[PDB]
Amino acid sequence: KETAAAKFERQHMDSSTSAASSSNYCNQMMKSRNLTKDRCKPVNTFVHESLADVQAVCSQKNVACKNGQTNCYQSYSTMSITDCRETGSSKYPNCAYKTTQANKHIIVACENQAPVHFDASV
Structure with missing residues (x-):
């Protein structure tokens, strides 16, 4: 089944909007991206930028995880x-989430030039 690169896109990429539209963003995306199947994932970040821009972060500032x-690699520019x-x-299988909008540098772990883990924001 899934490649680590494809798991990154599924868990972390929403290029369909420039910001979380409302407070129930997380409740809807945490469900529809399969992060609540077996248990509620406690914390998760969505990046509102092009796939191309997030992939590029792999050749920006090398940092410690x-x-x-x-x-690990930190974006030169803040991202939505x-x-x-x-x-x-919140209790499985009724997983509820707080939504919080932010503009911050993303720190990602890369493998073979591609984002495979979302580690932190600054």
């Missing part, structure tokens, strides 16, 4: 992102 790995984070009332 939270775990101390050295294959939505942070998704489970509410206190």
Whole structure:
């Protein structure tokens, strides 16, 4: 089944809008991208930029990952992102999320020139 590159797109890419339109953005996308199937993923970020622009981040500023790995990369420019984070009332299989809009640099782990993990924002 899924390649790590394709898992990145599915979990993290919404190029269909420049910002989260409303507060129920996360409830709808966390479900429709299969991040609540087996359990509610606690936190997840959506990037509102071209696939081309996010892929390019792999050849921008080389940085350390939270775990101390050295294959992480930070965008030269801030990007439009939505942070998704489970509410206190959330319980599998009824997973509920807080939506938060932000313009921040994305830090991604790359493999064979492609984004394969979303690590942090600054």
